[PDB]
UniProtKB/Swiss-Prot annotation, chain A:
Positions bearing N6-succinyllysine: K26, K38, K52, K54, K64, K68, K78, K84
Gene3D superfamilies to which the protein is assigned, alphabetical: GroES chaperonin (2.30.33.40)
Function: Co-chaperonin implicated in mitochondrial protein import and macromolecular assembly. Together with Hsp60, facilitates the correct folding of imported proteins. May also prevent misfolding and promote the refolding and proper assembly of unfolded polypeptides generated under stress conditions in the mitochondrial matrix. The functional units of these chaperonins consist of heptameric rings of the large subunit Hsp60, which function as a back-to-back double ring.
Protein name: 10 kDa heat shock protein, mitochondrial
Upregulation: By stress.
PANTHER family in alphabetical order: 10 KDA HEAT SHOCK PROTEIN (PTHR10772), 10 KDA HEAT SHOCK PROTEIN, MITOCHONDRIAL (PTHR10772:SF0)
UniProtKB/Swiss-Prot annotation, chain B:
Residue positions, PTM N6-acetyllysine: K29, K40, K43, K56, K74, K87, K88, K107, K130
Disease the record associates with this protein: Spastic paraplegia 13, autosomal dominant: A form of spastic paraplegia, a neurodegenerative disorder characterized by a slow, gradual, progressive weakness and spasticity of the lower limbs. Rate of progression and the severity of symptoms are quite variable. Initial symptoms may include difficulty with balance, weakness and stiffness in the legs, muscle spasms, and dragging the toes when walking. In some forms of the disorder, bladder symptoms (such as incontinence) may appear, or the weakness and stiffness may spread to other parts of the body.
Family as reported in the entry's similarity comment: Belongs to the chaperonin (HSP60) family.
Name assigned to this protein: 60 kDa heat shock protein, mitochondrial
N6-succinyllysine: residues bearing it: K29, K40, K43, K56, K74, K88
Function statement: Chaperonin implicated in mitochondrial protein import and macromolecular assembly. Together with Hsp10, facilitates the correct folding of imported proteins. May also prevent misfolding and promote the refolding and proper assembly of unfolded polypeptides generated under stress conditions in the mitochondrial matrix. The functional units of these chaperonins consist of heptameric rings of the large subunit Hsp60, which function as a back-to-back double ring.
Assembly and interaction partners: Homoheptamer arranged in a ring structure. The functional units of these chaperonins consist of heptameric rings of the large subunit Hsp60, which function as a back-to-back double ring. Interacts with 2 heptameric Hsp10 rings to form the symmetrical football complex. Interacts with HRAS. Interacts with ATAD3A. Interacts with ETFBKMT and EEF1AKMT3. Interacts with MFHAS1. (Microbial infection) Interacts with hepatitis B virus/HBV protein X.
Compartments, record wording: Mitochondrion matrix
Residues of the full protein shown: 163 to 299 of 573
């Protein structure tokens, strides 16, 4: 399980950081902070060792550090690392990843 | 036939007041013999005649942040776009494209609607204050 800055998720949880919100539109129209909701696009920065549901060895998570993923609407857990914000999800909660 | 007869009728009916007849004749000349003439009390000592041309309605700007003249706390735009909406404008998606078109064409935008709710109004004030985009609601 690839770690992060003095942190390591346990079991299948994955720690990600949400992408920056869109401040302006294409034509230059700027949006207020209270708008635009929450960003569902994130980058995987930490992955746990894996689940233990299957007997024997450990099954690693499908994602890896450095993947761009689409988060679900709800289910994350707020974590504070070096005064910055990260979100801990489960492995199966991730909707999909942007292959590129 | 002549406006002099109109002035004479108005003078006779006003207990022989020449000024009232002249004022009524001028109003009829400038708005038509079958126009809309209203009478209201005045705070001054003399009768006054004022003509409202074009379109004018008794609804001012919602937030006093679009003022760009400050001589009379008023907002003037020349060659402006107009967006008329039957329903309230509240969503971001219901106001952004109009602002995009106005900014691309570099023309001020008047937004006449029933009301502008929190999100769209906040966007309008933010864009007016920071970018300086010409807009009014």
């Amino acid at each position: 399980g690839q770690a992060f800055r003095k942190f390591l998720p346990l079991f299948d949880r994955v720690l990600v950081e949400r992408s920056a919100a869109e401040t302006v539109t294409k034509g230059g129209i700027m949006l207020p902070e209270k708008s635009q909701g929450k960003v569902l696009q994130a980058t995987v920065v930490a992955v746990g060792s894996g689940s233990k549901g299957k007997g024997g060895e450990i099954q690693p998570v499908s994602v890896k550090v450095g993947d761009k993923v689409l988060l679900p609407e709800y289910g994350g857990t707020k974590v504070v690392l070096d005064d910055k914000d990260y979100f801990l999800f489960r492995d199966g909660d991730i909707l999909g990843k942007y292959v590129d | 036939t002549t406006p002099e007869e109109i002035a004479q009728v108005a003078t006779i009916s006003a207990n022989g007041d020449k000024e009232i007849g002249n004022i009524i004749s001028d109003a009829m000349k400038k708005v038509g013999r079958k126009g809309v003439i209203t009478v209201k009390d005045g705070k001054t000592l003399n009768d006054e005649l004022e003509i409202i041309e074009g379109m004018k309605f008794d609804r001012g700007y919602i937030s006093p942040y679009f003022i760009n003249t400050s001589k009379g706390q008023k907002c003037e735009f020349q060659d402006a776009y107009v967006l008329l909406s039957e329903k309230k404008i509240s969503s971001i998606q219901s106001i952004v494209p109009a602002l995009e078109i106005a900014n691309a064409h570099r023309k001020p935008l008047v937004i006449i609607a029933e009301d502008v709710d929190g999100e769209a109004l906040s966007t309008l004030v933010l864009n007016r204050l920071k970018v300086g985009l010409q807009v009014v609601a």
